[PDB]
Structures are given as structure tokens and as C-alpha cells.
Write a protein that binds this ligand. Structure first.
Ligand SMILES: Cn1cc(Oc2ncncc2Cl)cn1
Ligand SMILES: Cn1cc(Oc2ncncc2Cl)cn1
Ligand SMILES: [Cl-]
Ligand SMILES: [Mg+2]
Ligand SMILES: [Mg+2]
Ligand SMILES: [Mg+2]
Ligand SMILES: [Mg+2]
Lengths: 194, 194
């Protein structure tokens, strides 16, 4: 039934553009939408990755490793899964492993990799791979891990037990002004609901 | 330590605007960001997303999802039922309303998240995630009658909770739909639990 008729550029910055999208509705009528896209997407299967890093150590409960950063669009701090854009020619897995080490200092092992999933599909075309990665916290590589953050990146690491994630995220939200990412919250909720 | 110094409008559509955000980085250096915002926010958040748990006796529990054409994606996406919160609507009420309009089901509130961010490196968009149970053995949920608005065209997809991830992966492979990242994250945590 439905499909894109035309995409007209309305405004283009260095990083994001806004487009007027003309599409065919399933009645047969022509309609429009205001679409956001990134300018950085090349031949990657998605814009970015988000990493679900499960930190595993003998005689410890498993922890989910999360990051806290200032986010300019939000005007504040947010708690999220480690994440970044996929470099040109980089695989989603390499990008996940790389971003996890840069944001946390951990060296992980790939567990699984999702298909490309949409971030906010009524607003933008942005997509990611969700890459699950186990971290062997008994390995010396991962003992006293140093974040190697890039140009103007300033990330704090927060490891929360998987068995109590939702309450621990609620505790954090109770204690400061800070926003939990929707993917992180959805994951915490399903841990509870299981 | 980090904060917003100012926001310059770049472009404002009917629904979405692009801004240039000046902010103070933690080194004490001024930096800029390209930020997307909706023009519709009043509210606690922009929207709600509903996790609708369809409970029918002697059947598997299902998570109720919707499939729609998304103009920004240029394709069909599988998502939790969702929409914008009307000015003066509570998140809980927007959840029950949107769940009804999109699926036909009449549900009960189980819990509601604080405002969580959709894509905080890109936008300030936020939602409340609202867990809702649907008593599928009540008469009002027998022949659920969707009340979809002008220009909305929503197909309902109910998937069993205890196989959700495998079922979604199967839909992506065979139907070439895009699964929403929140849906996928929830699905992943269901498998990752314990
Ligand atoms: C029901 N509703 C959906 C809205 O959002 C949009 N609609 C069109 N173009 C872009 C966007 Cl983001 C506003 N109200
Ligand atoms: C690492 N990286 C993140 C990027 O995205 C943006 N960067 C600045 N302003 C807005 C956006 Cl969306 C580009 N590269
Ligand atoms: Cl539940
Ligand atoms: Mg990042
Ligand atoms: Mg980074
Ligand atoms: Mg909707
Ligand atoms: Mg609507």
C-alpha cells in the first residue's frame, strides 16, 4: 500500500537535516510529513550502535554497564547504554566493541547483534544495531578499566546489577535531575516483567 | 559542570524544529550541537508508549504491537502503541486512549515510567513508558474495535511474550519491517532475565 513519493530538503546542518516527505497513504491520497535525518549516514546498515554490556564476574551478580553524559539536545544528563555512530566501513560489532572500550574501558566479547532498529520512527530515520556484549570482569584486561574518551566526550560509568536494574535506575532518578534512556528503561522493565 | 548557554533557531516546521545549541563543556570550553525538538510539547513528556500485556486464560501472554508506515523511515515499522499526550492529559490517560485508538483494547494501568529520552544525542524527545494489562477474556476486548484517527493506518500484531525476540527477528527477516528499538530492547531483556 504505502510508499515515499518525494523527499525535499528543508534545512541541512553539519549533522542533521530536516526534510519535507511526500508519501502515498493507503486510501490513495498524497500526504506530507516533516522528517529528520542524519547527514553522516553512508553505506552503514545503521547510523549507530548501542551496546548492552553484561559484566560477568565470579561470585558477583551480573551488572549492566551504562554511561552518564551531558546531552545538549536534552539540556541535561542522561543515563544510556554505551553507544556511538558506526564509522564508514566499520562493522556494527567492531563499532560496539570500540565504543564500549572508549566509553568504559571494558573489552568485551560479542554475544549477539540485532538487525537495524529505529530510534524514533515518527520523527527520524535514525537506526542502530543493538549489540549484546559480555565482559569478562575476572580478566586482567578488565580489572581497572580506563575510559579513552574522544574529542569533547566526557562519560561517567555506572554499573548496576541486572537483578535489580529498574529499582536502581529509579533510585538514581530520585537522587538527581537526570534522564534515563528509553531503551535502557524498556530493558529494565522486561527484566522485572520476566 | 555542563550546561546550556543558548539556543539558536535554525528552522521551524509545523511539527519539528532544528536548533543550534551552545553549551559549556566540562573543560570550560564553549561548544555547539545540532538539536531537534518537536513544536508540540506543552506536559511531562512529548508522548507515551504502551507496553500492552494481553492476558487470556489458557493462552500464552502476548505483547500487543502495532505496524504502520513511517514516513521518516520510508518503510513499515513494528512498535509499541504510542502517541503524543494531549495538553491536559495525564500520561496514564494518554496510554489508555492511545492503546484503545490504535488496537481497540481496553486496559488497566500497571505502572508508568518517569519521562525517558528517545534519542538524546539528537533530540529532546521524551515519553512515559506505560505498562498496561489487557484482560482478554472480558467482553469489551472480545472484538476489539480500533478508533484510528484521520491519516492513521495501524495493523495490530500480537506476539507471545515468552518467545518475543525470536518472533520479532522472524518478522524482520521475512517481512522486511523495522523493529523499534524500545520493542527490541524489551525483547532482549526477556531473554537475558535470570
Ligand atoms: C498526531 N501527530 C503526529 C505528529 O508529529 C508529526 N506529524 C507530522 N510530521 C512530523 C511529525 Cl514529528 C503531530 N501530531
Ligand atoms: C560523534 N558524533 C555525533 C554526531 O552527531 C551530532 N554531532 C553534533 N551535533 C549534532 C549531532 Cl546529531 C556526529 N558525530
Ligand atoms: Cl506486567
Ligand atoms: Mg556515545
Ligand atoms: Mg562516545
Ligand atoms: Mg501512534
Ligand atoms: Mg494520534
Amino acid at each position: 500500500k504505502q510508499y515515499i513519493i518525494s523527499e525535499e530538503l528543508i534545512s541541512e546542518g553539519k549533522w542533521v537535516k530536516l526534510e519535507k516527505t511526500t508519501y502515498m497513504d493507503p486510501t490513495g491520497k498524497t500526504r506530507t510529513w516533516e522528517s529528520v535525518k542524519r547527514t553522516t549516514r553512508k553505506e552503514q546498515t545503521a547510523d549507530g550502535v548501542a551496546v548492552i554490556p553484561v559484566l560477568q564476574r565470579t561470585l558477583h551478580y551480573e551488572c549492566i554497564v551504562l554511561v552518564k553524559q551531558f546531552r545538549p539536545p536534552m539540556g541535561g544528563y542522561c543515563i544510556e547504554f554505551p553507544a556511538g555512530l558506526i564509522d564508514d566501513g566499520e562493522t556494527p560489532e567492531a563499532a560496539a566493541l570500540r565504543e564500549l572500550e572508549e566509553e568504559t574501558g571494558y573489552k568485551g566479547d560479542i554475544a549477539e547483534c540485532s538487525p537495524a532498529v529505529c530510534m524514533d520512527p515518527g520523527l527520524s530515520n535514525c537506526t542502530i544495531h543493538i549489540v549484546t556484549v559480555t565482559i569478562n570482569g575476572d580478566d586482567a584486561e578488565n580489572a581497572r578499566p580506563k575510559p579513552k574518551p574522544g574529542d569533547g566526550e566526557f562519560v561517567e560509568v555506572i554499573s548496576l546489577p541486572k537483578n535489580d536494574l529498574l529499582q536502581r535506575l529509579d533510585a538514581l532518578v530520585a537522587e538527581e535531575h537526570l534522564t534515563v534512556d528509553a531503551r535502557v528503561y524498556s530493558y529494565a522493565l522486561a527484566l522485572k516483567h520476566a
